[PDB]
Design a protein around this ligand. Structure first.
Ligand SMILES: [Ca+2]
Ligand SMILES: [Ca+2]
Ligand SMILES: [Ca+2]
Ligand SMILES: [Ca+2]
Ligand SMILES: [Ca+2]
Ligand SMILES: [Ca+2]
Ligand SMILES: [Ca+2]
Ligand SMILES: [Cl-]
Ligand SMILES: [Cl-]
Lengths: 329, 329, 329, 328, 328, 109
RNA sequence: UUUCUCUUUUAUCUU
RNA sequence: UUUCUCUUUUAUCUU
RNA sequence: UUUCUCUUUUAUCUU
C-alpha cells in the first residue's frame, strides 16, 4: 500500500532477505539500508540438507551468528539437555573454505569484517504418517562472545584471558517464550539483530574450539563445548549480533524422523582488495528510516517460530504487520 | 485494472504462468513486436511415473522442442556423474512434426520460440508408504560449441555442439524449493533473454556429445541421448532456463505420481506443411504484458507444492494488479 | 496526417525504403530507427534485368537475405517443383566483388556484419498481347540458415557440423497464402524482418555451396542445392532475417514471356575502419517507436504480392493502412 | 521522467571513471530481470614500450582478458606474421578453470555492459617520444566453411574473427595525440539489445589448432597460450578498441594501463559465485535511451587529462538531450 | 525557430572535432535537394620537420588531396624555385582513377562543406623548437591568356591559380604560437552560396606541362606527380589554409597532422558510390545563417589544447546570437 | 502398420467376431514397485444383433424400437457433453449428471 | 451444474 | 489478523 | 479501402 511505496528498493529487499521465504527471495538485496554506505559484498548463504534423526535421542541444533557455518548440533540422551560432557559440531555452508581458507590463521584473507542481516532456519518433515514421532521445540538465546580472566601457576605465574560464550546456559531450559509442536508439523523461524544498530564485527583468527585448546571448561563458565574440528574443513571465523536459535528435536524409540533442513543468511562483508571476491562488491544501501523501523517492528511482532506449513504464508503475515503499524502512525 | 492488457496479451500471461487445462485455443501467441505468421503449439504431457527406491531420480525440463523432459537415476545421496546418461520423454506426436530421421526436423517448421514451460508432479502414493523429498532449482543451460583438434590425415580442427552450464545439475542450487515428496510440486520456467528471439531447428542431433565424440572434450559433465532417430531427437534449444528436479526415494519407499508438462511454442510453419493451415499472425506488441510478464516471473517462487497449482492463476492476477497499483504512483 | 508528423525524418524514410516503389524512393534513408545508433553504411541495392523465360519450363526464383546477391533461379520441367537434382544459381547485385572480394575467404574484408531493412522484387512483362502465356505464383518461406550434426567414418572417426538451410522444403508447395495471376499481369512484392528486433548478422566466410563441398545433399536435409559458383564472381556472404520470397513462373510451350526484373535491398552494414567504404558511413537512426510499430502493422497488413500494375499505387496503399491503424489508437 | 537507481549506476559503470568507486550497480536495466552476477573487472598494467616499435593493444569483448598485445616495426601494421597475446584480468582461472573445457563450469553465458581503457604515461618529459592513436573495430566472431581432403573427403567449419582487417589501418574516426598526454576511451554495445552470448569451450587459438591462417581469412593470429593460464571464453557484442602506441627510436615510453569491464553473467547453481547473484534490474527506458545517446555523442577517446572531467561531460549530455525533449 | 537534424549535423561536420565520431550528416542544408554522396575524408600523417627549415603546408580545396607540402630555408617563403607536393587522402585512386582523364569517371561535380586541419606535436619537451603560424588565403583557380608564336601564330589559355602571392608573407589575420602547443584550424565557404564545381580532367601540374611559371603569374609551382597516384581533380570554394612550421637548427619537431573534409559529390549512375547516395538535406535557413555567423566569429586557429573545447565554443556562439535575435 | 499385436488365442475359447462403431477406450494403470493394487473391473455392452432363424437365440428377439428424434439428439448431446471419465466415486451420480445435461439443452431449444 | 451486468474480442446475417 | 461499545484497572500529562 | 444497424456466435474482464 502507501507503506510499500515509502521504502526504497534496497529497503524492501532488505526486509525480504530478513523474513521472506528462501524461494520467494530470489534477490538478496543490495544489503543493509543504514548510515553505512561503504564497499561490501552481500552473500546470501543457503544450506539444504537431508537429515535423519537418531531414534531414542534428543538432537539439539544451534543457529549462531558465525560466518560460514549454518548450524551446530549434538545429540544427547532423550529427555535431557546438554552437559559438560557435550560438544557441538558445526555444519558448513557451501564453500566455507573458499571464504575463510583452510588454516585457523587464514580467515581474514578474503574479508576483514562482517555483519549479519537475516538468519533464518526451517525444518521440513519427509516422514510418512506411519513413521513419524517426537516434537520440535524452539526458543532463542542471547548468546554473545565475551572473554574470561583467570590466573595461571606457570613460571613466572601469569594471568590469562580467552574467548568465552556468555549466556550459553540458556540452552539448558526451554524459556517461556518458545515454539513447540509435533515433529511432523515442522518449524520455521528467523532471528534478528540484537543490537540498536548494525555494527560490523571483526573476523576472528585461530579460533577452532571453545573452550580453546589448553583450557578447562571449568575456567570458562560455558556449560558445554564447541568444536569446529579440523582447521582445514571448518572453524569459528567470528560471532555476529543475532540471538541464537535453539532447537530441541525429540525422537522416540522406534520412530523414523526424516526431514529437510534449510538455512538462510544475508551477510554483508568487507572485502579485501586482494580477494577474488572484491569484483562482486558494491556500496551499502543508503539509510531507509522506514525500512529500519519496519524491521524492528516486524521482528518484535512475529512469533518465535511457525509450523513448516505456513512458511510461504510468512511473507504475507509480514506485509500485514507493516501496513497495520504504518497505518496507526 | 487487468483491462490494460490486449486480449492476447492477457491470454499470453495465462499460457505462461498457469496450467491452462482449460481448453482455450492453446495460446494466442507472443505480444512482442513480431507479428509474422506462426503456429501456437500447446504441448502437454501426462506421464504416470513410479520412482525406484534408494535412487535419487533427476528430471530436466529443457527447452528442447518435442521433448517434455529428460531423466536418469543415481544412487541415493548422489548426483549425476560422467557415467550418467539422460533419456528424453517426448510430448505426444513428436514424429508427427519432426519426422523419423535426424535430417527431417526442418521439414514441417523452420524456427521456433518458447513462451511457457510449466511442470507439475502430483503424488499418487498412499500416506503410509511414501517417503523422501522433491527438490527444485533452475539452471541457465545454454547450447554452445567446443573447438578442438583431431589427429587425422590431414590433421584438422573440429567444432561441435556442447551444452554449457550443465554442471549446475551436480548440486542443489541455493535458490530452490525443497519439501516432502507427498506434497508434490508445480513450477515453471521463463525466457532467459531480454527478448523473444527465434531459434533455428537443428538437424542431425541425436546425442550430446555427438557420436564419435569423446565425453569431456565437450566439457559436459554427463550425456544426453535421445535414442533412435525415428522415435526422438534434439531439434533445438530454447531460451528458457532448464528446470531441475531431484526426487530422492529412500529405501523401501513407494513413491508414485503423475507428471504434467505444458509448453506454449510459436513455430514458423512451412507452406508445404499441412500444419501451416493453423497459422495466424503473432499478436501485436502489448507493452504492458511484456512488462508484467517480467515482473510476475521475478516475483513467483522457485516452485510451490502441487496443491497451489489452482491458486496459481489467482496468485498471478494479484501480483499484476499489485504492480499496476504502484504504476499509478 | 497526424500520423505522418509523429515520425522522425529517419522513421519515414525507413518506411519508404521498405514498401515504397524503387522510383519514388530516391532517398534510401539514414537507415533503421531503433535502439542501435552505431556507425553503419546504408546501401540500397538495385538490380534491373531484361530476362526472357524458357518456354515449356517453369522457372523458380528465390529472393533470400544474402548480401550482394539479388536472387537465385533454376528452371525445371513444366508442372514440377525443384528436386534433389536441382541447383539454384545466384545473380549478383552490381559490384558484388567491390564489397566481398573475389575469394571465398575475403568477404569480411570490407564489412564485418549486416542487417536487412527492405527486400522487394518486381516483374514487369514486356511481351505483346499475341505472345504472352503462363502464370506467376508467389509465396514466402521462412528459410533460415542453421546447422547439421552427423558422424564420419574417418580415421580416427569424427563428428561433423556444417551449415544447412532449414525450411527450404517450403519451396516445394504453393502455400495457402499466395499470389497467383497470369504472367502478363506481372507481380510486385516485398519481404520483412522475421524477427522481433533488427539484430545484426555476421558475414560468413568460405561459403560457396550448400550443401558445402564434400557433403552429400542427403546428410543436410535440404531438398535441393545452392551453388554460387566461382568464388571470384559470386558467393554466400551471409543470411539475413527476412522471409524468402519464392516465385514460380510457368512458361507454356511456344509462349514468349519477356519481362524486366527489379530488386530492392535496403541493407545496413558495419564498415571496417580500413574499407574505402567507411568514409560514406554515418550513425544509425535513433529509435522511432512509431515507425517501428507502423512497420510491423503495414507489413502484416499488406498482401502477399500485387500485380505489377499497382506498383506505384503501392506507396499510397501503405500510407492508407498507417492512418487507419494510427487513427484507431 | 527520471532514472532508476540501477539505471543511473548502469550509466556510470558504462562511461564513469573507475576512480569514482564506481558501483557495478545491479547490472543492466532492460526487459530482462533474470538472476545474474555482476563483475567489475579491473586491471592495472605497468608497461614499457619498445622503441622503434608500434605496439598494438586490442580491447576485445573476451571475458577474463583485459587486452591483447602485439608489436610491429614502427610505421607498420600487423601482418600474417603477427600473433596477439592476451593479458588476463585478475583471477581468470577462478572463473574459467584451467582446461580449455572448464570455462562453462562457473557461468553459462554473459553480456557486457561497459568496456573502458586508459593509458597513463609515467615517463618523464624529455625521455618520452611517439604518439597514441585510437579507433574502434566492429570485430565479430563468425565461422568459415572449407573442404578437407581426408578419407573420406569432408567439409570443415570453424570459428573465424571477421573485421580484423580493420586493424591494419587507422580508422578515419580516430583519436590521435602525443604519447605523453595519455588517453581514455570506452566501447558500447554494438547491438540494438543486450542479448546474452554463450560461454565458448575449447578455444585457445584463432586460427584454431590445425587450421592455416589462409583458411580463415583472418589477417593475423590470436593465441591465448596455455589452457591453464588463459583462453578465449566467449566473444561479446562490443566494438573492439584499437590502440597504437607509436614509439620511435630512443624513445622511453613507460605508462600504466587500466582496463574496466562491467559484465553480467548467468551463474551456474553449483558455482560459488551464485550466492553473490541478484536479479537483473528492471527495464529503465530512460537509461536505455540515454546510454544510446551518450554513447553516440562522446568522442572516440580523450587525453588522460580529461578522465575526471568525463563524468561531467556525461551529466551535461544527459540533461542537454533531456532538454530538447523536456520542452514539448 | 530551431535547427533540423541535418542542419545541426552540417554545423558539426563544419566546425566539430573529428574525435567526436562526427556524422557526415546528410550533407548541406540549402535550397538544393538533389542526389549526392557525402564523404568524410580523414587523413592521419605522422611527420618530422627538417631543422633549419620552414615547412609550408597548404590546405586547399582540391578533392582527394589532404594537403600540399613544400619546404624552404628558415626565414624564407616559397619562391619560383618552389614546388608543392600533395599528400592524398585515403583511396584517392578509388575515386579518381589512375589517369589524368579518369577523374570524372566516378563523380561529375562537388562542393565542400568543411575543411579542417590539426597538428599534434609528438616531440618531447626539450627536443622541440620553432613555431607554428597560420593564416588563410583566398586562392581561386582562374585562367591566363597569352599568345604563342607557332605556325600559324596562336593564343593560349590555361589554368592559373590566383592569390598564391598571399603565401609569400604572413597574413595580418593570423595565429602564431610555439610549435609544441600544436594547432587546430578550419576553413569556410568563400562564396555566398554552396554552388557545385565541376570535376577537372587532365590537370597534373600548375603551371601545366609546356607552360613557363612566367606565363602564369603564379609565384611558385604545384605538382601532383604520377597521374597514377595523384592529381588535381577540381578546385573548391573554400579559402586555403596556410601553415608555416618554423623549425630552427637542431630542433626535433615531430607531430601528427589530421585533415578533415566534408564533401558532397554528384554521383554518376554507373559508379559504385551511387548506392550510398541520398538527397541533399532540405534548406535550413537557421543553420545557413549560423554557419555564416559561427565562421566569422571563430578565431583563425587555436592551440591543439582547445581542440575538444571547440564544440563548446560553437554551442556558445550559437545561442549567444540566437539570443540577441531571440529577445525581439 | 499396426504398432502392436492382437491375439485372441485358441479359436475354441475366444476370437474376433467383428468390429463396432465405438471409439476405443484406452486405460493405463501404473503400479509402482511394492504397491498392492487390487480392484474390481466391470464392463457394459448394449448390443443389438440380427438373429439367425436357426439360432436357439431367435426366440428372444423382438423388433427394433421406432425412431425417437429426441432420444437421438439427446444421446449425441449428452455424449459430447460428458467428461472423458469420472472417478469411481461418482458412478451413481452419473445418471443424475446426465439427466441434468438433458433438461439443460432441451430447455434452451 | 449455478446468477447477471461490463468491456470484451473475434464472427457472420442484414442496409 | 478482524468490529465496536461497557465497566474495567492501572498509568502519566495537565489545572 | 468505404457506412451503420441486426441477430449473430464464440471470447475473456468484472459481481
Ligand atoms: Ca556460566
Ligand atoms: Ca534480439
Ligand atoms: Ca564442464
Ligand atoms: Ca529437410
Ligand atoms: Ca579477411
Ligand atoms: Ca601573380
Ligand atoms: Ca500405422
Ligand atoms: Cl541434500
Ligand atoms: Cl538490362
Amino acid at each position: 500500500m502507501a507503506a510499500l511505496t515509502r521504502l526504497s528498493q534496497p529497503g524492501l529487499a532488505f526486509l525480504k532477505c530478513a523474513f521472506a521465504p528462501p524461494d520467494f527471495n530470489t534477490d538478496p538485496g543490495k544489503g543493509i539500508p543504514d548510515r553505512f554506505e561503504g564497499k561490501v559484498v552481500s552473500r546470501k548463504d543457503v544450506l539444504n540438507q537431508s537429515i535423519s534423526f537418531t531414534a531414542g535421542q534428543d538432537t539439539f541444533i544451534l543457529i549462531a551468528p558465525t560466518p560460514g557455518v549454518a548450524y551446530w548440533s549434538a545429540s544427547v540422551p532423550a529427555g535431557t539437555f546438554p552437559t559438560s560432557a557435550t560438544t557441538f559440531n558445526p555444519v558448513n555452508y557451501p564453500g566455507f573454505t573458499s571464504m575463510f581458507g583452510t588454516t585457523s590463521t587464514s580467515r581474514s584473507d578474503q574479508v576483514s569484517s562482517f555483519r549479519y542481516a537475516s538468519m533464518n532456519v526451517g525444518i521440513y518433515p519427509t516422514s510418512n504418517l506411519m513413521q513419524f514421532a517426537g516434537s520440535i521445540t524452539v526458543w532463542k538465546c542471547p548468546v554473545k562472545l565475551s572473554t574470561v580472566q583467570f590466573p595461571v601457576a606457570t613460571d613466572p605465574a601469569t594471568s590469562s584471558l580467552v574467548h568465552t560464550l556468555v549466556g550459553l546456559d540458556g540452552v539448558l531450559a526451554v524459556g517461556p517464550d518458545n515454539f513447540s509442536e509435533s515433529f511432523i508439523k515442522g518449524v520455521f523461524s528467523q532471528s534478528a539483530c540484537n543490537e540498536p544498530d548494525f555494527e560490523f564485527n571483526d573476523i576472528l583468527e585461530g579460533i577452532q574450539t571453545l573452550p580453546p585448546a589448553n583450557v578447562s571448561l571449568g575456567s570458562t563458565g560455558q556449560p558445554f563445548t564447541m568444536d569446529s574440528g579440523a582447521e582445514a574443513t571448518s572453524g569459528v571465523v567470528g560471532w555476529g549480533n543475532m540471538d541464537t536459535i535453539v532447537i530441541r528435536v525429540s525422537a522416540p524409540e522406534g520412530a523414523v524422523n526424516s526431514a529437510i533442513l534449510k538455512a538462510w543468511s544475508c551477510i554483508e562483508y568487507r572485502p579485501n582488495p586482494n580477494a577474488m571476491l572484491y569484483q562482486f562488491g558494491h556500496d551499502s544501501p543508503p539509510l531507509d528510516e522506514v525500512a529500519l523501523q519496519e524491521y524492528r517492528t516486524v521482528a518484535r511482532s512475529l512469533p518465535v517460530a511457525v509450523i513448516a506449513a505456513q512458511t510461504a504464508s510468512m511473507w504475507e503475515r509480514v506485509k500485514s504487520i507493516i501496513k497495520s503499524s504504518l497505518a496507526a502512525a
